[PDB]
């Protein structure tokens, strides 16, 4: 449909967001994910802490390098769940995975771009209420992700400028709605009304 789709990660279930993002790529849609830190995982924090440590303990024994690589940062945790749903050892796979970017936070392109939500990955809609769950950044930071606080500081600084933006917008789009307000009742209006507008 669109050239690039920005997905606010906040409030989404990793594996369900992963599965849709995996498929967008394979069908050619470029995807960029933001706020991977505030991604969710079903299940209470401790289990998810344990699970990662199980991941953590697997490595090629004679050389720890060639064995599995354990990434900490929420994006790479999420890129991993996403890579795991793609054919990535093929060329078509590498191809699909280039169409994807994942970021913790919202870096400078995309902070003034528009970010979407995938309801079938959305935690609020998906989980039975009162089922314990996990914010991804908090997990990442307990397995060694060092940047949780920077992202927070930047996001809060950023979240302030976005309200300045939204403030002026809500004010100007109050003027606009006082403009259509008088053009209502007009000859042109009540005709557009007739056809559905």
Partner 1 sequence: TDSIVKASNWRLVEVGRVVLIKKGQSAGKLAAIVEIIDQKKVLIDGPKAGVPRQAINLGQVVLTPLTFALPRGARTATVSKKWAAAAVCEKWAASSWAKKIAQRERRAALTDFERFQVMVLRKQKRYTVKKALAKA
Partner 2 sequence: MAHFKEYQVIGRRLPTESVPEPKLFRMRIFASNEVIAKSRYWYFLQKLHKVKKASGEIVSINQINEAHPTKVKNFGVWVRYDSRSGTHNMYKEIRDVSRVAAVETLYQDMAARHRARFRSIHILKVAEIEKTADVKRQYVKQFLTKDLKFPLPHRVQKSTKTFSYKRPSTFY
Partner 3 sequence: AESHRLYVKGKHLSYQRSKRVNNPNVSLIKIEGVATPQDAQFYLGKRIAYVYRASKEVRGSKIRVMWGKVTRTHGNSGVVRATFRNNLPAKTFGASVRIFLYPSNI
Partner RNA sequence: GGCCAGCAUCAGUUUUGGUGGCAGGAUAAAUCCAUAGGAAUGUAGCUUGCCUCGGUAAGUAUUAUAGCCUGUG
Partner RNA sequence: AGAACUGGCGAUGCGGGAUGAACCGAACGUAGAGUUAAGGUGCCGGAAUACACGCUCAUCAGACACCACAAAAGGUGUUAGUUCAUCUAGACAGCCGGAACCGGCCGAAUGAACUA
Partner RNA sequence: UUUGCUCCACACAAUAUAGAUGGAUACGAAUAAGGCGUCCUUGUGGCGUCGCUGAACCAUAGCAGGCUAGCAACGGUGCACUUGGCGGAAAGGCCUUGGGUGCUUGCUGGCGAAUUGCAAUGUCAUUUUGCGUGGGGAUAAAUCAUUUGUAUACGACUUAGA
- According to DSSP, residue 154 is labeled H
Contact between residue 43 and residue 52 where contact means Cβ atoms under 8 Å apart: no
Give the shortest CB-188-to-partner 1 separation in angstroms: 5
Q: Which of 57, 63, 182, 185 binds partner 1 (CB under 8 A)?
A: 182
Give the shortest CB-171-to-partner 1 separation in angstroms: 13
Q: Report the SS3 class of residue 69.
A: coil
Q: Which stretch binds RNA (CB under 7 A): 9-17, 61-69, 136-144?
A: 9-17
Nearest to 75 by CA among 43, 110, 33: 33
CA distance 178 to 189: 14
Nearest to 112 by CA among 74, 173, 169, 171: 169
- Residue 16 binds RNA (CB under 7 A): yes
Give the shortest CB-41-to-RNA separation in angstroms: 12
Q: Which stretch binds partner 1 (CB under 8 A): 22-30, 47-55, 160-168, 173-181?
A: 173-181
**Residue 27 to residues 56, 113, 122, Cα–Cα distance (Å):** 32, 23, 21
| Of residues 149 and 187, the one with the C-beta less far from partner 1 | 187
**Residue 122 to residues 9, 35, 113, 142, 143, Cα–Cα distance (Å):** 9, 14, 21, 24, 25
**Binding to partner 3 (CB under 8 A): which residues in 30-49?**
none
CA distance 5 to 99: 10
The binding site for partner 2 (CB under 8 A) comprises 5, 7, 11, 20, 114, 116-120, 122, 124-125, 129
The binding site for RNA (CB under 7 A) comprises 2-4, 6, 8, 10-11, 15-16, 18-20, 22-23, 26, 28, 30, 32, 38, 43-44, 46-47, 50, 85-87, 90-92, 95, 98-99, 103, 105-115, 119-121, 124, 128-129, 131-132, 151, 154-155, 157-159, 161-163, 165-166, 169-171, 174, 197
């Amino acid at each position: 449909v669109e050239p690039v789709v920005v997905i606010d990660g906040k409030g989404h279930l990793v594996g369900r967001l992963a599965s849709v993002v995996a498929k967008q790529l394979l069908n050619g849609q470029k995807i960029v994910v933001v706020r991977a830190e505030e991604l969710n995982i079903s299940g209470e924090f401790f289990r998810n802490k344990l699970k990662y440590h199980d991941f953590l303990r697997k490595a090629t024994a004679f050389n720890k390098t060639r064995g599995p690589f354990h990434f900490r940062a929420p994006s790479r945790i999420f890129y991993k769940a996403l890579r795991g749903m793609v054919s990535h050892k093929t060329a078509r796979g590498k191809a699909a995975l280039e169409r994807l970017k994942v970021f913790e936070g919202i870096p400078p392109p995309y902070d003034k771009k528009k970010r979407v939500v995938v309801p079938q990955a959305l935690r609020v809609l998906r989980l039975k209420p009162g089922r314990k769950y996990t914010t991804l950044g908090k997990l990442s930071t307990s397995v060694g992700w060092k940047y949780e606080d920077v992202v927070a500081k930047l996001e809060a600084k950023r979240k302030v400028s976005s309200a300045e933006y939204y403030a002026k917008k809500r004010a100007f789009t109050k003027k606009v709605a006082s403009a259509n307000a008088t053009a209502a009742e007009s000859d042109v209006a009540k005709q557009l009304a007739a056809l559905g507008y």
